[PDB]
Amino acid sequence: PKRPTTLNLF
Amino acid sequence: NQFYSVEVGDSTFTVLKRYQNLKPIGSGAQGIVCAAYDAVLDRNVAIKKLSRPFQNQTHAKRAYRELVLMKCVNHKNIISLLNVFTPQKTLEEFQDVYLVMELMDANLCQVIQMELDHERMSYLLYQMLCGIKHLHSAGIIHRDLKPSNIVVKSDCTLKILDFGLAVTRYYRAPEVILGMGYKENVDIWSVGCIMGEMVRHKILFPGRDYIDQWNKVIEQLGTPCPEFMKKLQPTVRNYVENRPKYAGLTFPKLFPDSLFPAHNKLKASQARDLLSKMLVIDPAKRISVDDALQHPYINVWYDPAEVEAPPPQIYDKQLDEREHTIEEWKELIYKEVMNS
Ligand SMILES: Cc1csc(NC(=O)CN2C(=O)CCc3ccccc32)c1-c1ncn[nH]1
């Protein structure tokens, strides 16, 4: 139930 | 209250003073869109200037629908309208309409090309589905989902832009591209095109005419069942029935373990499974929004607040239906375009 908090749009 | 001008190509954007540093992030037929700083929220927003809102009756009906549709929806996975304004101060000189929306970092075109672990993949797809389901509950079937109108933030949140609808063909459902009718799970087809492409890093069904688009469908998914092909108008059928007869490549072959984070097997078979159910030519055999959300690959993320959230209004099936004069469309839109 702990979702990602980051997404590498870099 | 007070306005200023910024050029922006051949277009002039006259906007409330609180919106600053305008630069073009996209254009087309809907209208031109700039990113902008909102001084009053200290946040970046997107300003869309509607393309000739009152050129004719379809332009006008399309602008009022944009607005009445927007104010049927309120969800964390749907881009919300923040403000709308007009620089004109009276009904008879009114022409320009600006929509101000939430801004994100990027569309999914970036993300499809990278390489995601299961929680990000699964979590993006879960948010896509909560947004789609909220559209459907409001009476909105989108029909035009694809990577370019699904937008994302570097914190891994995601929103769906317009609805649908509104070159774009690759993601369109078979019932659409063969002129059958459609219901809710037409958007399910498109989620499988996005998801399948997220795993494979290329467009599932290319071409360049619908003709060639159908080819890549059958080449990969096999020819549909004979009963499905009766439902098709005599004309579409004759064509479809007389193409080469493929068995289909199957989902392990289309999407093997080699393509996924791995054990993690599990796990890839969960993703494979969902795709085997989403990418089903026949809408009557295809997974619905609900079952896709109840599916083991997505259902990890389940929150009652995000899934069961009812819309502020279910969209008026019709009026849809209903014509006005361009003077009477003006009145309805001006009414909104300063509606407090
Ligand atoms: C209306 C609207 C509301 S949010 C949004 N865009 C995004 O959220 C993501 N986004 C894009 O996708 C195009 C490239 C881009 C550059 C700078 C900032 C954002 C974006 C838009 C939009 N982007 C492109 N056309 N319209």
Short mmCIF file of C-alpha atoms and ligand atoms in Angstrom, two decimals:
data_model
loop_
_atom_site.label_atom_id
_atom_site.label_comp_id
_atom_site.label_asym_id
_atom_site.label_seq_id
_atom_site.Cartn_x
_atom_site.Cartn_y
_atom_site.Cartn_z
CA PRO A 1 0.00 0.00 0.00
CA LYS A 2 3.01 2.44 -0.23
CA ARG A 3 2.87 4.13 -3.66
CA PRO A 4 5.81 5.59 -5.57
CA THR A 5 6.52 9.25 -4.85
CA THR A 6 8.93 9.86 -7.74
CA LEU A 7 8.91 9.52 -11.55
CA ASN A 8 12.02 10.18 -13.57
CA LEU A 9 10.88 12.70 -16.15
CA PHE A 10 14.52 13.75 -16.44
CA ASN B 1 -10.18 43.28 -13.51
CA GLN B 2 -7.03 44.25 -15.52
CA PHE B 3 -5.42 42.63 -18.57
CA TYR B 4 -2.21 42.71 -20.60
CA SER B 5 -1.08 41.34 -23.99
CA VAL B 6 1.59 38.83 -24.94
CA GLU B 7 2.03 37.76 -28.59
CA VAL B 8 2.68 33.97 -28.77
CA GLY B 9 3.26 33.28 -32.52
CA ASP B 10 0.57 34.73 -34.78
CA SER B 11 -1.82 34.72 -31.85
CA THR B 12 -2.35 37.42 -29.18
CA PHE B 13 -3.04 36.25 -25.61
CA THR B 14 -4.74 39.04 -23.58
CA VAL B 15 -4.91 37.65 -19.98
CA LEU B 16 -5.55 38.69 -16.33
CA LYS B 17 -2.37 40.23 -14.96
CA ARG B 18 -1.83 37.37 -12.41
CA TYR B 19 -0.68 35.14 -15.32
CA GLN B 20 2.88 35.84 -16.28
CA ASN B 21 5.71 34.23 -18.27
CA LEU B 22 3.44 32.76 -20.94
CA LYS B 23 5.11 30.37 -23.40
CA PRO B 24 3.49 27.95 -25.91
CA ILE B 25 3.32 24.30 -24.87
CA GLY B 26 0.96 22.99 -27.52
CA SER B 27 -1.51 23.87 -30.22
CA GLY B 28 -4.10 22.45 -32.59
CA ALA B 29 -7.78 22.68 -33.44
CA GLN B 30 -9.15 23.00 -29.92
CA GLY B 31 -7.01 26.15 -29.44
CA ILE B 32 -3.57 27.35 -28.38
CA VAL B 33 -2.17 26.52 -24.95
CA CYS B 34 0.59 28.23 -22.93
CA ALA B 35 2.16 27.34 -19.61
CA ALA B 36 2.04 30.32 -17.21
CA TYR B 37 2.86 31.31 -13.71
CA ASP B 38 -0.27 32.19 -11.60
CA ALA B 39 0.87 35.01 -9.20
CA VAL B 40 -2.30 34.61 -7.07
CA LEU B 41 -1.75 30.84 -6.39
CA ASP B 42 2.01 30.87 -6.75
CA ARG B 43 1.65 27.84 -9.03
CA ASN B 44 2.08 27.09 -12.69
CA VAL B 45 -1.12 26.62 -14.73
CA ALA B 46 -2.05 26.10 -18.45
CA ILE B 47 -3.99 28.81 -20.37
CA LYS B 48 -5.95 27.66 -23.43
CA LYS B 49 -7.38 30.20 -25.78
CA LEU B 50 -10.30 28.67 -27.63
CA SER B 51 -9.94 28.65 -31.41
CA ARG B 52 -12.68 30.85 -32.89
CA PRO B 53 -15.34 29.89 -30.29
CA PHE B 54 -18.18 31.60 -32.29
CA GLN B 55 -17.08 31.07 -35.91
CA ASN B 56 -20.20 28.96 -36.42
CA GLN B 57 -22.63 26.75 -34.43
CA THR B 58 -20.43 23.67 -34.01
CA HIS B 59 -17.50 25.81 -32.73
CA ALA B 60 -19.89 27.38 -30.22
CA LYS B 61 -21.56 24.09 -29.12
CA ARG B 62 -18.06 22.61 -28.63
CA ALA B 63 -16.98 25.45 -26.32
CA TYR B 64 -20.03 25.26 -24.10
CA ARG B 65 -19.70 21.44 -23.89
CA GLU B 66 -15.97 21.88 -22.81
CA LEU B 67 -17.41 23.96 -19.94
CA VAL B 68 -20.50 22.00 -18.94
CA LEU B 69 -18.41 18.78 -19.07
CA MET B 70 -15.75 20.27 -16.82
CA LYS B 71 -18.24 21.18 -14.19
CA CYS B 72 -19.51 17.61 -14.09
CA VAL B 73 -16.08 16.36 -12.88
CA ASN B 74 -13.84 16.67 -9.80
CA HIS B 75 -11.04 14.13 -9.39
CA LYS B 76 -7.34 13.90 -8.67
CA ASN B 77 -6.76 11.97 -11.93
CA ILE B 78 -8.58 14.43 -14.19
CA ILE B 79 -7.18 17.86 -15.19
CA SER B 80 -9.48 20.45 -13.54
CA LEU B 81 -10.50 23.89 -14.80
CA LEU B 82 -9.18 26.46 -12.39
CA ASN B 83 -10.47 29.70 -13.88
CA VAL B 84 -12.00 31.04 -17.11
CA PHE B 85 -11.99 34.68 -18.13
CA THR B 86 -12.51 37.04 -21.16
CA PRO B 87 -10.88 40.35 -21.83
CA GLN B 88 -14.17 41.77 -23.21
CA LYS B 89 -16.41 43.67 -20.82
CA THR B 90 -19.80 43.33 -22.46
CA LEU B 91 -21.80 40.65 -24.21
CA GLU B 92 -21.77 42.32 -27.66
CA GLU B 93 -17.98 42.78 -27.86
CA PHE B 94 -17.25 39.36 -26.34
CA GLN B 95 -15.23 36.94 -28.58
CA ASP B 96 -12.29 35.36 -26.76
CA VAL B 97 -12.51 32.65 -24.17
CA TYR B 98 -9.56 31.47 -22.03
CA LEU B 99 -9.58 28.28 -19.97
CA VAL B 100 -7.11 27.94 -17.09
CA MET B 101 -6.27 24.42 -16.00
CA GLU B 102 -3.82 22.51 -13.79
CA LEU B 103 -0.35 22.07 -15.22
CA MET B 104 1.79 18.93 -15.09
CA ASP B 105 5.35 18.29 -16.19
CA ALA B 106 4.97 16.07 -19.26
CA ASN B 107 2.69 13.74 -21.32
CA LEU B 108 3.20 9.90 -21.24
CA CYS B 109 5.27 9.95 -24.46
CA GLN B 110 8.41 10.33 -22.17
CA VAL B 111 7.41 7.58 -19.82
CA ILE B 112 6.58 4.86 -22.37
CA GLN B 113 10.16 5.00 -23.58
CA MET B 114 11.78 4.72 -20.14
CA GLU B 115 11.72 1.44 -18.23
CA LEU B 116 9.50 1.11 -15.23
CA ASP B 117 9.36 -1.28 -12.32
CA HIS B 118 5.98 -2.82 -11.44
CA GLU B 119 4.85 -0.33 -8.82
CA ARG B 120 5.23 2.69 -11.09
CA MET B 121 3.65 0.93 -14.11
CA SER B 122 0.92 -0.55 -12.00
CA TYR B 123 0.45 2.77 -10.14
CA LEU B 124 0.19 4.95 -13.33
CA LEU B 125 -2.35 2.40 -14.79
CA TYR B 126 -4.32 2.47 -11.49
CA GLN B 127 -4.56 6.31 -11.63
CA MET B 128 -5.51 6.16 -15.38
CA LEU B 129 -8.35 3.78 -14.36
CA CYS B 130 -9.62 5.94 -11.44
CA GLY B 131 -9.76 8.92 -13.79
CA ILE B 132 -11.50 6.89 -16.55
CA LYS B 133 -14.04 5.50 -14.08
CA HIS B 134 -14.85 9.00 -12.81
CA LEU B 135 -15.42 10.21 -16.39
CA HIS B 136 -17.78 7.21 -17.02
CA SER B 137 -19.86 7.82 -13.81
CA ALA B 138 -20.37 11.42 -14.98
CA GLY B 139 -21.75 10.14 -18.30
CA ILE B 140 -18.43 10.85 -20.17
CA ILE B 141 -16.98 8.19 -22.54
CA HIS B 142 -13.69 9.52 -23.80
CA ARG B 143 -13.06 7.45 -26.94
CA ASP B 144 -9.81 9.31 -27.67
CA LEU B 145 -7.31 8.21 -24.97
CA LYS B 146 -3.59 8.16 -25.89
CA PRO B 147 -0.12 9.09 -24.36
CA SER B 148 -0.31 12.73 -25.44
CA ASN B 149 -3.47 13.61 -23.42
CA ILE B 150 -2.37 11.74 -20.30
CA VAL B 151 -0.04 13.93 -18.32
CA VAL B 152 2.26 13.26 -15.44
CA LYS B 153 4.33 14.79 -12.69
CA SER B 154 7.78 13.86 -11.41
CA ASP B 155 6.05 12.86 -8.10
CA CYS B 156 4.38 10.01 -10.16
CA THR B 157 0.86 11.53 -10.07
CA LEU B 158 -1.16 11.51 -13.29
CA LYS B 159 -4.13 13.26 -14.87
CA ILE B 160 -6.20 12.78 -18.01
CA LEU B 161 -6.59 15.94 -20.06
CA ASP B 162 -9.82 16.52 -22.02
CA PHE B 163 -12.87 14.22 -22.46
CA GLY B 164 -12.52 12.85 -24.92
CA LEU B 165 -12.73 14.20 -27.56
CA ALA B 166 -11.84 17.14 -27.36
CA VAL B 167 -3.47 11.64 -36.25
CA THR B 168 -4.53 9.69 -33.09
CA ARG B 169 -5.66 6.43 -34.67
CA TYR B 170 -3.22 3.94 -33.05
CA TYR B 171 -5.09 3.77 -29.73
CA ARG B 172 -8.63 3.72 -31.05
CA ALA B 173 -10.83 0.73 -30.30
CA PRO B 174 -11.89 -1.78 -33.04
CA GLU B 175 -15.58 -1.00 -32.48
CA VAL B 176 -14.66 2.67 -33.28
CA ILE B 177 -12.36 1.98 -36.23
CA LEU B 178 -15.03 -0.40 -37.71
CA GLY B 179 -17.98 1.95 -37.00
CA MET B 180 -19.86 -0.33 -34.59
CA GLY B 181 -21.26 1.40 -31.54
CA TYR B 182 -19.33 1.53 -28.29
CA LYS B 183 -19.81 1.72 -24.55
CA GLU B 184 -17.74 2.28 -21.44
CA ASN B 185 -15.01 -0.38 -22.16
CA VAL B 186 -14.01 1.33 -25.44
CA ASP B 187 -11.56 3.26 -23.15
CA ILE B 188 -10.30 -0.12 -21.87
CA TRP B 189 -8.96 -0.89 -25.37
CA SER B 190 -6.88 2.27 -25.27
CA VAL B 191 -5.43 1.57 -21.80
CA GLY B 192 -4.14 -1.76 -23.24
CA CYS B 193 -2.58 0.07 -26.19
CA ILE B 194 -0.82 2.42 -23.71
CA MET B 195 0.12 -0.37 -21.28
CA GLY B 196 1.26 -2.78 -24.00
CA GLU B 197 3.36 -0.02 -25.51
CA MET B 198 4.74 0.89 -22.05
CA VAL B 199 6.09 -2.70 -21.79
CA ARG B 200 7.28 -2.98 -25.44
CA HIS B 201 8.44 0.62 -26.03
CA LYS B 202 6.75 0.74 -29.41
CA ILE B 203 3.27 1.46 -30.76
CA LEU B 204 1.31 -1.79 -30.68
CA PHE B 205 -0.71 -0.99 -33.81
CA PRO B 206 1.03 1.48 -36.28
CA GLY B 207 -0.26 2.58 -39.79
CA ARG B 208 -1.23 5.14 -41.39
CA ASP B 209 -4.76 4.50 -42.60
CA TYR B 210 -7.25 2.42 -40.59
CA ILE B 211 -6.77 -0.29 -43.30
CA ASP B 212 -3.21 -0.92 -42.09
CA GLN B 213 -4.21 -0.40 -38.47
CA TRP B 214 -6.62 -3.36 -38.70
CA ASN B 215 -3.73 -5.40 -40.22
CA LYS B 216 -1.53 -4.96 -37.19
CA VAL B 217 -4.45 -5.77 -34.92
CA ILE B 218 -5.15 -9.19 -36.57
CA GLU B 219 -1.41 -9.90 -37.21
CA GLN B 220 -0.90 -9.83 -33.44
CA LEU B 221 -4.26 -10.65 -31.92
CA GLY B 222 -5.49 -13.10 -34.58
CA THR B 223 -8.69 -12.84 -36.59
CA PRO B 224 -11.74 -12.35 -34.31
CA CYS B 225 -14.55 -14.89 -33.93
CA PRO B 226 -17.11 -15.38 -36.80
CA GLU B 227 -20.00 -14.26 -34.60
CA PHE B 228 -18.27 -10.88 -33.87
CA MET B 229 -18.03 -10.41 -37.69
CA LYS B 230 -21.80 -10.73 -38.20
CA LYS B 231 -22.43 -7.71 -35.89
CA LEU B 232 -20.44 -5.64 -38.44
CA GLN B 233 -22.31 -3.76 -41.18
CA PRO B 234 -22.37 -5.71 -44.45
CA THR B 235 -19.52 -3.72 -46.04
CA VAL B 236 -17.05 -3.61 -43.13
CA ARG B 237 -17.57 -7.41 -42.80
CA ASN B 238 -16.99 -8.35 -46.45
CA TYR B 239 -13.61 -6.54 -46.14
CA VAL B 240 -12.71 -7.93 -42.66
CA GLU B 241 -13.93 -11.49 -43.42
CA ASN B 242 -11.71 -11.71 -46.54
CA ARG B 243 -8.40 -10.76 -44.94
CA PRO B 244 -5.78 -13.44 -44.10
CA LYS B 245 -6.77 -15.64 -41.15
CA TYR B 246 -4.31 -15.33 -38.27
CA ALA B 247 -4.35 -17.41 -35.08
CA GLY B 248 -2.72 -14.52 -33.19
CA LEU B 249 0.69 -14.41 -31.56
CA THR B 250 -0.48 -15.02 -27.98
CA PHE B 251 0.39 -12.91 -24.94
CA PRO B 252 3.47 -14.74 -23.64
CA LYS B 253 4.97 -14.29 -27.15
CA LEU B 254 3.80 -10.65 -27.52
CA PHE B 255 4.94 -9.79 -23.98
CA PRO B 256 7.54 -12.33 -22.70
CA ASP B 257 9.25 -12.25 -19.29
CA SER B 258 12.37 -10.79 -20.95
CA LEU B 259 10.40 -7.52 -21.21
CA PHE B 260 9.54 -7.08 -17.52
CA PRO B 261 11.35 -6.19 -14.20
CA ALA B 262 11.83 -9.98 -14.19
CA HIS B 263 10.72 -12.90 -9.42
CA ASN B 264 8.79 -10.67 -10.43
CA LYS B 265 7.29 -13.91 -11.68
CA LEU B 266 4.60 -13.82 -10.17
CA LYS B 267 4.01 -10.80 -11.46
CA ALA B 268 4.78 -10.26 -15.12
CA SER B 269 2.06 -12.91 -15.62
CA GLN B 270 -0.33 -10.57 -13.76
CA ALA B 271 0.55 -7.74 -16.26
CA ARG B 272 0.37 -10.24 -19.13
CA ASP B 273 -2.97 -11.41 -17.81
CA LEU B 274 -4.51 -7.91 -17.65
CA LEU B 275 -3.27 -7.13 -21.17
CA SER B 276 -4.77 -10.39 -22.39
CA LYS B 277 -8.12 -9.12 -21.09
CA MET B 278 -7.79 -5.44 -22.07
CA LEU B 279 -6.68 -6.11 -25.66
CA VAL B 280 -9.71 -8.07 -26.75
CA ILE B 281 -11.14 -7.11 -30.13
CA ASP B 282 -14.71 -7.86 -29.07
CA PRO B 283 -15.93 -5.31 -26.48
CA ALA B 284 -18.32 -8.00 -25.13
CA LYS B 285 -15.27 -10.15 -24.27
CA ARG B 286 -13.13 -7.26 -23.00
CA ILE B 287 -12.47 -6.44 -19.31
CA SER B 288 -14.56 -3.58 -17.86
CA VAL B 289 -13.20 -0.65 -15.81
CA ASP B 290 -14.36 -2.26 -12.61
CA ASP B 291 -12.77 -5.67 -13.16
CA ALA B 292 -9.55 -4.07 -14.42
CA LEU B 293 -9.52 -2.18 -11.06
CA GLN B 294 -10.36 -5.30 -9.09
CA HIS B 295 -7.56 -7.09 -11.07
CA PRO B 296 -4.57 -8.34 -8.93
CA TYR B 297 -2.03 -6.26 -10.88
CA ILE B 298 -4.01 -2.97 -10.24
CA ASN B 299 -5.98 -3.82 -7.07
CA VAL B 300 -2.87 -3.47 -4.80
CA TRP B 301 -3.48 0.29 -4.92
CA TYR B 302 -7.16 0.23 -4.08
CA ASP B 303 -8.49 3.14 -2.04
CA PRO B 304 -12.29 3.57 -1.61
CA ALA B 305 -11.89 7.41 -1.80
CA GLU B 306 -10.27 7.42 -5.25
CA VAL B 307 -12.34 4.54 -6.78
CA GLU B 308 -15.96 5.00 -5.48
CA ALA B 309 -15.97 8.87 -5.55
CA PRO B 310 -19.29 9.94 -7.21
CA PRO B 311 -19.15 12.93 -9.69
CA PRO B 312 -20.52 16.44 -8.80
CA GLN B 313 -23.06 15.85 -11.58
CA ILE B 314 -23.87 13.14 -14.11
CA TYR B 315 -23.63 14.84 -17.52
CA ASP B 316 -26.93 15.69 -19.22
CA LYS B 317 -27.22 12.73 -21.60
CA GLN B 318 -29.05 15.34 -23.68
CA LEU B 319 -29.17 18.46 -24.04
CA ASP B 320 -26.73 17.23 -26.78
CA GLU B 321 -29.36 17.75 -28.55
CA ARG B 322 -30.53 21.41 -28.31
CA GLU B 323 -29.50 24.23 -30.65
CA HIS B 324 -29.17 28.01 -30.03
CA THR B 325 -28.34 31.05 -32.12
CA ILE B 326 -24.76 32.41 -32.03
CA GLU B 327 -26.16 35.34 -30.03
CA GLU B 328 -27.69 32.72 -27.60
CA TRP B 329 -24.49 30.66 -27.39
CA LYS B 330 -22.56 33.82 -26.61
CA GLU B 331 -24.97 34.53 -23.74
CA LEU B 332 -24.59 31.06 -22.26
CA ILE B 333 -20.77 31.12 -22.56
CA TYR B 334 -20.29 34.75 -21.35
CA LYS B 335 -22.40 33.66 -18.36
CA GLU B 336 -19.77 31.03 -17.51
CA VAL B 337 -16.81 33.18 -18.55
CA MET B 338 -17.19 35.51 -15.55
CA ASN B 339 -19.39 33.05 -13.52
CA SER B 340 -17.58 34.19 -10.36
C1 LIG C 1 -4.36 22.06 -21.38
C2 LIG C 1 -3.23 21.40 -20.59
C3 LIG C 1 -3.41 21.27 -19.20
S1 LIG C 1 -1.99 20.46 -18.51
C4 LIG C 1 -1.10 20.29 -19.96
N1 LIG C 1 0.14 19.75 -20.15
C5 LIG C 1 0.76 19.00 -19.25
O1 LIG C 1 0.29 18.89 -18.12
C6 LIG C 1 2.02 18.32 -19.73
N2 LIG C 1 2.62 18.92 -20.95
C7 LIG C 1 2.40 18.46 -22.22
O2 LIG C 1 1.67 17.51 -22.49
C8 LIG C 1 3.07 19.13 -23.39
C9 LIG C 1 4.52 19.47 -23.07
C10 LIG C 1 4.51 20.32 -21.82
C11 LIG C 1 5.38 21.41 -21.67
C12 LIG C 1 5.37 22.18 -20.52
C13 LIG C 1 4.46 21.87 -19.51
C14 LIG C 1 3.54 20.81 -19.63
C15 LIG C 1 3.52 20.01 -20.77
C16 LIG C 1 -1.91 20.85 -21.05
C17 LIG C 1 -1.41 20.80 -22.46
N3 LIG C 1 -0.19 20.38 -22.77
C18 LIG C 1 -0.13 20.42 -24.12
N4 LIG C 1 -1.30 20.85 -24.61
N5 LIG C 1 -2.13 21.09 -23.51
#
